[PDB]
Amino acid sequence: RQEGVAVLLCVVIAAWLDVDAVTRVLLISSVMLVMIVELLNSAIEAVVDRIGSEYHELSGRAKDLGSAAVLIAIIDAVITWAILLWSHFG
Amino acid sequence: GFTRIIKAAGYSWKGLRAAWINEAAFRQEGVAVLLCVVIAAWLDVDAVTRVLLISSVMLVMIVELLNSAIEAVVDRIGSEYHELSGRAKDLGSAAVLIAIIDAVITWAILLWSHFG
Amino acid sequence: AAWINEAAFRQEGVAVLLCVVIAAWLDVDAVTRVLLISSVMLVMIVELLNSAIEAVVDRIGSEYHELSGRAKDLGSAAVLIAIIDAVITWAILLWSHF
Numbered sequence A: 001r002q003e004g005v006a007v008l009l010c011v012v013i014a015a016w017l018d019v020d021a022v023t024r025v026l027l028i029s030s031v032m033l034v035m036i037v038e039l040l041n042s043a044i045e046a047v048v049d050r051i052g053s054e055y056h057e058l059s060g061r062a063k064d065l066g067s068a069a070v071l072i073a074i075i076d077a078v079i080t081w082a083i084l085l086w087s088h089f090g
Numbered sequence B: 001g002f003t004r005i006i007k008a009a010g011y012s013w014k015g016l017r018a019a020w021i022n023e024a025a026f027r028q029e030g031v032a033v034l035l036c037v038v039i040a041a042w043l044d045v046d047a048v049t050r051v052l053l054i055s056s057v058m059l060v061m062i063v064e065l066l067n068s069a070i071e072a073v074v075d076r077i078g079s080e081y082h083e084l085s086g087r088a089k090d091l092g093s094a095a096v097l098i099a100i101i102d103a104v105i106t107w108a109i110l111l112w113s114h115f116g
Numbered sequence C: 001a002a003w004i005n006e007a008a009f010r011q012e013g014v015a016v017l018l019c020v021v022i023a024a025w026l027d028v029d030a031v032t033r034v035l036l037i038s039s040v041m042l043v044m045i046v047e048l049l050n051s052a053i054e055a056v057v058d059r060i061g062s063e064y065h066e067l068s069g070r071a072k073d074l075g076s077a078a079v080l081i082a083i084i085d086a087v088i089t090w091a092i093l094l095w096s097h098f
């Protein structure tokens, strides 16, 4: 459950930085989206494990698609922070 | 290509219709989202601010719908109590509350900055 | 990643990819650029979650159940709202750009 640490740290950094309201909303939203997509991904895999523990083509497919989503949200969070911090310190 | 969109649009309308017919809470939420999109559309704000007010509430809807999809799968498997059944719905509901709080705060921060 | 080799995801993925490349090249401010990019990436995220759910449903069986269709429809509706949000975002932001 160390994932909440990452989120708190981001909010602390965002508050610590001297940025406008819009920038701060984007920095924190992007982190919040990651959290949302991870929880939705964990729900899906909970359902997969509820159906059965044995392997199946569609169970793996479900988990692979869920994980890819989390990855996309993570990439989007990193791009956001990079772009905004580059602009703030430009 | 064109046939794939028409079919998916049909499924999408059945989905909005079912969620709407089935629950008062969903209807009232959809009311709240449409009021926010309208208010954001008429506010004298910059374009980026306008987008954030709209996106934050639309995200509420997206997560609401995705979570209702998972609830339907869990209820599809069985209405009987199960640990992963309860857990799936718990993680799903958390995701909905996060998005809703994030929208409320976003609206509070931006409208406070716009007004005074 | 056997799913990225399908025509459905490829057509949706390549569209999102182009929008991110266009956004990367546009002459706009930073917060505008972040918004253009993250809105089309949200389409991709939701579209992946929707296929995950569809996969779980098909996992259960080929027999039809009302909640099976409902799960798939609600997933499709989520994708639709995400797409609308992306179109709205690009419209509002690039209308001003002119």
Ligand SMILES: CCCCCCCC/C=C\CCCCCC(=O)OC[C@H](O)CO
Binding pocket: A086
């Ligand atoms: C495959 C992933 C990427 C590779 C791993 C990371 C490598 C980072 C190394 C050097 C930093 C170069 C300069 C970075 C700063 C930079 O680009 O500043 C311009 C402004 O961003 C324009 O606004």
Ligand SMILES: CCCCCCCC/C=C\CCCCCC(=O)OC[C@H](O)CO
Binding pocket: A079, A082, A083, A084, A086, A087, A090, C024, C025, C029, C030, C031, C033
């Ligand atoms: C996946 C490959 C990663 C490869 C590593 C680099 C990733 C840099 C992040 C975003 C690029 C967006 C476009 C960059 C230029 C850009 O946005 O400049 C204006 C800014 O707003 C600063 O003022």
